[PDB]
Amino acid sequence: PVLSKDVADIESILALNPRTQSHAALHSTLAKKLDKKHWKRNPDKNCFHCEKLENNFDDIKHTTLGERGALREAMRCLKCADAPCQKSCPTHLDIKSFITSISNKNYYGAAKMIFSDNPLGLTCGMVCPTSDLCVGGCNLYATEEGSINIGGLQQFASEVFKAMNIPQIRNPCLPSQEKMPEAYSAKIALLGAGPASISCASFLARLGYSDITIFEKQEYVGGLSTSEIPQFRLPYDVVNFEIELMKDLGVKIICGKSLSENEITLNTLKEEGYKAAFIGIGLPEPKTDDIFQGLTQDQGFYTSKDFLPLVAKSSKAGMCACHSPLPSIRGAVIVLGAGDTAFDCATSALRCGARRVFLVFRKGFVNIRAVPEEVELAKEEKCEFLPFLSPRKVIVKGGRIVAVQFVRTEQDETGKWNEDEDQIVHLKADVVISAFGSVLRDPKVKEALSPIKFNRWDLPEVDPETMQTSEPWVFAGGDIVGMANTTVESVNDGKQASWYIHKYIQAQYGASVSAKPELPLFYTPVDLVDISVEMAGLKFINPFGLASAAPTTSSSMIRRAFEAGWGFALTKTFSLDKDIVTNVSPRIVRGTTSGPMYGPGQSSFLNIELISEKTAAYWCQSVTELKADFPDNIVIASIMCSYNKNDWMELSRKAEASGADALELNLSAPHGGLACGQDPELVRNICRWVRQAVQIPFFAKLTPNVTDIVSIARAAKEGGADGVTATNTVSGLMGLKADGTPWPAVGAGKRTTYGGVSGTAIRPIALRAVTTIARALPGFPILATGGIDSAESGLQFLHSGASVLQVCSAVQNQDFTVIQDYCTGLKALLYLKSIEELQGWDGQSPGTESHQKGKPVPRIAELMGKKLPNFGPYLEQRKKIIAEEKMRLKEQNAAFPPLERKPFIPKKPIPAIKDVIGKALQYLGTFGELSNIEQVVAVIDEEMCINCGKCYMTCNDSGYQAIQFDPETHLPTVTDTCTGCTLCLSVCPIIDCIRMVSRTTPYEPKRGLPL
Amino acid sequence: PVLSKDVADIESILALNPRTQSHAALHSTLAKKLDKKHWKRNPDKNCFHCEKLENNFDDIKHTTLGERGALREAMRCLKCADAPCQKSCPTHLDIKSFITSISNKNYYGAAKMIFSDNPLGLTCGMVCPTSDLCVGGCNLYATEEGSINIGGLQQFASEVFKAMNIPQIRNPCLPSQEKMPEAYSAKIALLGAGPASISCASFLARLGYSDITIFEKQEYVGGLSTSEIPQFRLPYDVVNFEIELMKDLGVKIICGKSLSENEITLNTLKEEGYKAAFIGIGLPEPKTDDIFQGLTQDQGFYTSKDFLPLVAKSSKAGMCACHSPLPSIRGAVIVLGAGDTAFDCATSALRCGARRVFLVFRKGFVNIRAVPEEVELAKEEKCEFLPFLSPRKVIVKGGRIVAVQFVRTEQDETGKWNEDEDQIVHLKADVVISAFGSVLRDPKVKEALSPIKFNRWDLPEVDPETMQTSEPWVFAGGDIVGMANTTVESVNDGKQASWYIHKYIQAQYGASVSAKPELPLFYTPVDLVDISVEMAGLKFINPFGLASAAPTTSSSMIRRAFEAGWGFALTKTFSLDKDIVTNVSPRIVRGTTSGPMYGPGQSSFLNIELISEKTAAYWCQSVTELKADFPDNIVIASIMCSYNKNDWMELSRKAEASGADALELNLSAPHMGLACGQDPELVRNICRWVRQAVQIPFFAKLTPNVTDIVSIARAAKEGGADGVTATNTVSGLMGLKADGTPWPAVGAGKRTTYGGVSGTAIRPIALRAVTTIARALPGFPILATGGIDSAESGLQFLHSGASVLQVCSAVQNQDFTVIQDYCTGLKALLYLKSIEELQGWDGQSPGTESHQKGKPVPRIAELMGKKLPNFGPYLEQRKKIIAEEKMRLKEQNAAFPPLERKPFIPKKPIPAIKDVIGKALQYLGTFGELSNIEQVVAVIDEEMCINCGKCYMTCNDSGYQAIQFDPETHLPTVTDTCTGCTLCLSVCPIIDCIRMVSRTTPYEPKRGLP
C-alpha cells in the first residue's frame, strides 16, 4: 500500500489534530451562543442560582496551592532586597527567604523560616487578609500579572512540613536545663488559649522557661481559630498541629479554669507564686443591639457567638466529645454586620441549609470592613448585599421570626449618619444572625484584672511597645487590647510581649538581658544533621562553595560569604604581574536558553570576562587575612599561567605561602584545541610542575569543551593532581539581535567573541562530565560546578560522585544568603532518608495525589471513571454528585476520629555526605545493558487532567498517533499502540498526571515493512 | 590596610543587602500598622474617597499588556488542541496560533491571524467581555494561576501591527481586477458604519467585490465604538485604524445619509441599481420611561444616548470637526440601569466632575448583567450601588432635579417581581442618567425597510444561519437583529452575512459558489515576501525543515508536515537490515535546564533513542512516494552504517535510487571518543565512500561533542561532502531523583545511559558551531540544527552562516503548524528591514519606552526628576500631580493636530535569504579585536523601575558594590564605580529599564594593590 499515508483508523485518531488554515471559518452567532455552554469553566454571569452547599465544608480558599502551582509562583517572585512584603507583614516574616526555599524545592527550610517568626504560620497562611498586609506591599503589583500569592505559598510549605510529622525541639543553643539559671523556672501564667497566648508561650519556651501554663476557659483550645472561623477556610487539624508544636516545648494547657472573680484572678495568681501573667482572653461577648432583646434561638435569632460555635462543633472533628447536629437553618437568613464575622456567618448559614442569605449593612459598599478576599467568597455563593439599612423591628408570628423592619440610613454634608423614619424596608426572613462584632463586657472578668488600668474603650491599657499593663508583672495582647483585628497581629502581640516578660522576670531574679531583643528561631531535629564532608585531606563544614567567578571578584565578598555560611570559596583566578589582564565591557549577559523570561531564575549567563584584574599580591594577602579570620572555612587559590614551568612553580608557591588550603589550576591559557586544558599532555606536565613546587593539595579545573574529558582528568591524576574541578563554562554564542549584531557587543564596531555559558542550562553537560570521571577514575576527588542552584541539584551531583559543590550563577541570580537555603535543604533531604513512613516521597515532595487546582478530588464512586471533566454540563454533574454525597454524609452523623498526631522517628541512622557520594553511579551503564524486554506504556489519570491535548498533539506530530482525544470531553486515552517513548509525560503541564507503567500486552516494534 | 574588608563607604552602600538572620525579629503591632502605609501598592480598603478623575481619559483596563508582560503570558498559554477558548469566541479566532506567534515574538503573524477572522481585532481585544466568551472556556482556569489574558494578548499583537503602519492589500489569490467576472461589480449597499457593516463590507471586499458603499447617518464612523464606548476603554485611534484597513480594500463610506422613509429606503436602493443591502444600523433610540418625559439636560436629566456621545465628542480627538465641551456634571449623579451602558455612564460621569455616583437598579446584585470586568471598574472608582429600587418620580424644584423617589422591589414565591408602595427611598441627586438600554422605534426608519417582516420584538426577522431577511436581497446583523450583545458578535454577524450575500449576488448573475463557505484570510504586502533559498544546487521553498528525529518517526508524519507548509524534511536515520535496532522505554524526557516548569516551552529534552526501527525498504519506498506527491519539497534521507566501506556505499545507493534529493550521514556509530563523527580521519573516509557511490548531494551531520568541530567539518569537506549539518545533540544527563534513581530509568534495574540534549538550552552551542564553521570554510553550505523555535531564532542562524534551518524540539513542544508562524515571521523580519521609519526597532519589537504595567508613563514636568516611586505616599503625590495636569489639560485644550495615518512604504529593496546569510560574521573575532578603551556603564530609568533591588543585590554579591539602593524609595542609582560588567541589566525583570551607555568619566581598572 501507500506507506506514507495514514490509514482510516489513524485518520480518525488525528481528527482533532491542529492543521494549518487557508480560509476564515464560518460559524453563526446563534450556533456560537449554543456551543459556549459546553466548554464553560468559570462562573456563568447569567446564573442567579447558587449551587447546593449544605453540609459541604470543603476548602473554598482561592489561594490554596498544590506543588505544581507553588513551584510556578515561587519562581515568579523577584525575591527582593529589603522586601516591602516583609515590611508589611506584622510578624516580619522573611518572605524573600522562604519563597526562595520553595522555588528550590526546600519546603522544610521555607517552613522553618515561616515558623521562626510566626508559630501559627499555617493558620496565618490560610486566613491572613494579605491584600491589606504583605501582598499589599508586593513589588510585583507593578506588573500586569500582579502580586505574589504569599499566603498560598506560606500555606503550602507549612502543609508539607506538617505532613513530614517532625517535632519542634528545645532551642539547641540553650544549656541542658539542669544548668539553667533559677530564673527560668519562674511560674508563668497565660490566660486564654488563642493565637496571642499560644505565640507568647511558644516564644517564652524558646527562651528556656520551663514552667509555662495556659489557663483556658473552654474545653477546646485555639480560640477563635477553633470556635468560629469556619472549617471550609481553616481546617481544625491545622490548629491542632500548631498546638502540638507548642507542647513539644513543654507548655502546659489547663482547660476549665477562667480568669474571673471567684476563679482565677491576678490576686490568686500572685498568692500562688506566679511571677508573670499574660492576658490573651480575646473579646468574649457579642456586640448587641437593644432591638433584639428577648429573642431566642427557638424563634430563629442568633448572635455570632451562638451560631458560629454551633457550626464549628458539628464540623470540626476533634473539637468536642459531642457529635453536634448541624443547626437546621431553613429559609431566608438575615445576617447583620460588615466585618469578617458577618461574612463567615453568611457562608456558614448556607452550609446549614439556608435557602437565601441577606447581608445587611448600616453603611454602604465602600465601607465594608472585611477585605475583598473575604467578601468575594460570599458574593460567589450568591449572598445578596443590602446597604444603608438599620434594623428597627423584628416580627414574630407563630413562635418564629417572619420579618425584620429596617430604616434607611444616609449621610449629609457634614458626613453624619442619619436614619430616615419615613423610609422603611420590610424584609421577610426566618433566621436573624447579628454579627456586629465583639466586646469585653463581663464585670467579673474585669474585676479579676484588678488593679490594672482600663482605657476609654473599657479595655486593658498596655504600653504598645512592650505590651505591659499598668502592673509590671502583667502583660496583655491580641483582641483584648483592641488594636489587633487579625490572627497574625495577635500572634505578633504575644511575640512582642514574650521579650519584655523575659526582661521583667530576669530582672526580678537580679539578672539583665541584652539591650537588643534576641528571640530564638524555630528548631527541629533536622537542624542537628551533620553536613560536613572530608575530601583530599581537607575538612569542609558544608559541601557548598563559591566558584572562581564574579561572586569572588573581591576578597571582601568572600568574607561576607563566609559570614553568611558558605563552606568554602575560590579566589577569582589570578596570575603573575606580567600576565595582568584588562576586561572589556559589556561582558556578562543573560541567557536566551529559556526564552524571553526576565528577572529571577535566568537559565544561563554568557560571559567574555577574563581572569582577575586584581594582582597576585592582593590575592595572596587576602588569602592570609581570610584564613586568619575563618580557619574552618576552606580557601582555594585559583591560578593561571602560560605554558611555562618556571611560571607555574613561582605562582603556585606564592599562593601556597599565602596559606591557601589548596590550589585550583585554571587550564584556560592558550598554547600552540588551543587551551592547555584541551590537550592531555599539556595538562599532565602542568600538574607535574605544580606537584614538584607545592605540598598542599591542588585540583585541575577541566574544560567541558573537549572530545574526551576523562582523558584530561586521567592526565591530571597521572601528573599528580589531588582532584579535578568539573567543569568550567561551555563555549557558546548566546544570540544575535535581529539586525545581526551580537550581545555582548563591545565598542562602536559592536564586536564580540565566543564566551562561556554557565548556569542550569549547562547542568546536563556538567552532570555527565562528573559522572563519566567518577565512573572511570573511582575515588578521584571531584569538585562539581555547573548549574547547581539548590540542595536538591547539589545532591544529584553528590550522588554522581562529586564531594563538594561550587556555585556561581545561582548567586548571580540572587545573593549570598541562598547558602542558608542550601544547608537546611541538604539537612532535610538527608534526615528524610531515615523516615520509613515517607519512603513514597521524592525528597521533600509528597507523592502526588489526584487533585484539581491544588485541592484533592473527592474520592466518590459515582464521581470516578464516569468521564466527567471539570467544565460545562459535566461540571454541573460533578457538583450534583458531590452535593448528594454531602447530604448522605449528613443523614448518617458518625465518624469523628481525627487521628492523634505522633511524630515519625528515624529508623536508621541519618546518612552523612560520605554515605551518599557516588551511590547513583551503579544505575549508569552502556546501552547494551538497558533492557529492551521490559517496556512501558503511558497511562493518564483523568481526574488530574486539564484537557489541553498537549499529550495528543505531541504523540501525533512527534510520536506514534496512539492517543485518542475525545471531541466532547477533551479527555485523552492512551491506546495499545503506545511505545512508551514518554514524550507525552514530558510535555504534560500537570505533574504526575501521566505515568509510565509496565506494559502488559504483547509488544512488537513497528518496522513499517518486514526485515 | 585589611584588603578583605569593606571600607566604611562600601559598608554604607551595602546597608540594605540581604544577610542571614540569627534571631526572630521584634516589631510592635503599632509600629507595623504605621510602617505599612509607606510601602502600599494596591487600593486601601479603608479609603472611601474616589481619587478624582475629572477630564482623565487615560486607559483603565486591567488587561492591557506591554511587551514584557505579553511575552510572559503568551509563554504561559498551553496552546491547546481543539482549543475551547476558540470554541467560545464568536468569531472563532485561532487563539492557539496567534498566542503561539506572540510567544515566538512574531507579532505580525499574530495580528494577521487575528484580523483574518475578526477585522475589528484591536477593538475586540480591548472591549470583549472575555469572561463570558473565550476566557470563560480557557483550560487554564483549572490551575491556581488561572485563565489566560486572551484579550490583552490580542490587543498587544494588534497594537504592534498598528504601529508598523502596514496596509491591508487586495486578496492576492484573486485574478486581476480586469479579469474579474461581471458579478463582482454588483452595487452593494450597507446601512450604518458600525462593527457589523465594517465586518460585512471587509469580507465582501476580500471576496473581490469592487463597488461597496457604506451609508452612515452621522458625520462620524465606527458606531457605538466611537459614539458611546469611553475613550478610557477604547481609544478613538483604534477605530480609525480599523476603518482605514477596510478602506484599503476600496470600500467607500458616505456620511450624512440615513435609512429613513424620506431618504434611503429599500425601494430607492432597488431603483438606483443596488443588487444587495445589509442593514447594520443598530438600535438608535434609548429606552425611556414615562417618569422622565419633559425633563431637559439643563434640568439634569440625560439618557445614555444623550450623555455618552457628548463625552465622546469632547474626549475623542478627530471624532468630530467641532471641538465640544465636556458636560457640566456637578454634584450627585444617579445612573439607572445595570448593563454595560450604565457602568460606562457611571465612570464617564466622574470624568465630567461628579462628586458622587449612585448606580441604582431594580433587581439585586446577583441580577447585574454586565460582566464582572465592567463592574469592577465602577467599584474601584467608588461608585455606590443601590439594589432593589425602581424609580417612581423625579423631584424638580427651581427648574432642576433635586431628588428621585424610588420604591423597593422584591422577589416572591414564583420569582416574579413586585413593587412595594409603602417602602420608599428619597435619594437626593442633581443629575439623572437613564441607561435602560436601546431600541428601534423611529417609524420613518421602520417604514424605509418595507416590506421585510419584523418579529414580536419589533426587529427585522432573519434566518440565523444566513442573516437573510424575508426579502432575499436584504440581510441584517448586529444589534438591530437582537441576538448580538457585543462588538465581536456584531462582527461575526457581518462575517456570516457576507458569504450568503456573496451567494445571492453570484446566483443573480447566473453563477454558483462552493457548497462549503470559504472566506479569504487577511493579507498585507508582508505576505508577498519571497523566503526561498538555494543551497547545494537544491531549491528550498522556505528554509524551515524537520530534523531527523521523533517528528519524522513515520513518513505519514512527513506527508502531513509538507501539507502544513514545511520546506523540507529529513527521514529518521535508517540503516541496513543487519543493523536493525530495538528501542527501549522510557527514552525521551523533559529538560531540567530551566527549573520545575511543566507544559509548554520546555527548554530542552534528553533522549536515549536509537536510529529508526523501520526498515530501509519502508523508508526508500516512502521517499519515492513523498517525492512523487511533493516535488517542490526537499526530502533528505538520513542514513547510518558501521565503519564499513561496502555498507555505506550500498545504503547510500539504495537511498539515492529512491529519489532522495540529498543524503544526510549520521556519524553516531561506534567504531578520542567512541563515535565515528568524533575522529576526522573516520569522517573523511566515510564521506569519501559515499561520494564515490552516489551523485546527489550529501551532508555530514556533525556532533558537537568534540574539541574542535571545524576539524570534523573540514574532514567531511575533504571527503567530498556538499555541506554539513550542525549540530546533533549534546551529550548529557538530565538528572536524578532524590533517592539516586535516574530519569529516564529503564527496566526493573532502573538503569540509564548517557543521552543527547536537544532544544533551546543547546542553542548557544549550535550557534557557536555554525559561526565557527562558516568563518573557517566560507561558502560551505551549513544546515543549522539546535534550539531553533521561531523565525527570530532562525534568522540568527542564517545571520551566522547557515542556509537552511532544521527543527525538532520546537515541534515536540507543539505540533507541525508552527511552520506557519515561522514563515510569516521571517517574511515580516525581512520586510521590516526595508522600512526606514522602523529602523529603531529590534526586529518586530518596538523601541521600549517608559511604561508601568505596560501603560505609558505620563511625561509631565512635575513628575520627573522628582524621585516618586509608584507606592505609598509617593504614589499619592504622583496621582495628585497627574490630576492637576488633567485639569490644566482641560484648558490648554487642543484636538486639531491629528495625523493622517499614511502607511510606511519600503524605501530600499526587501532582502532575500541569500542577502542575510553570514552577515553577522563581520562582528565576530578574537578577544584581542575587542576595544578595552570604549567602556560602558549601567544607567537605570527610574520611571520604569519596580523597586525590587535585584540590580543592587547582584552588584553587591557578584559585582562591584556600585549601586545605591535608597531605603525610603527603593530606587537604585548606579554610581561612578560601575565597571560595565552588565550583570545588573541581565537580571532586571523590566526589559530595557537598565541601559549600558558609553563611559564619560575616566576609567581605571580595579587592581586591589598596586
Ligand SMILES: O=c1cc[nH]c(=O)[nH]1
Ligand atoms: O576560566 C574562565 C575565565 C573567565 N570566564 C569563564 O567562564 N571561565
Ligand code: SF4
Ligand atoms: S532590577 Fe530593575 S526593576 Fe529591580 S530595582 Fe533594579 S532597575 Fe529597578
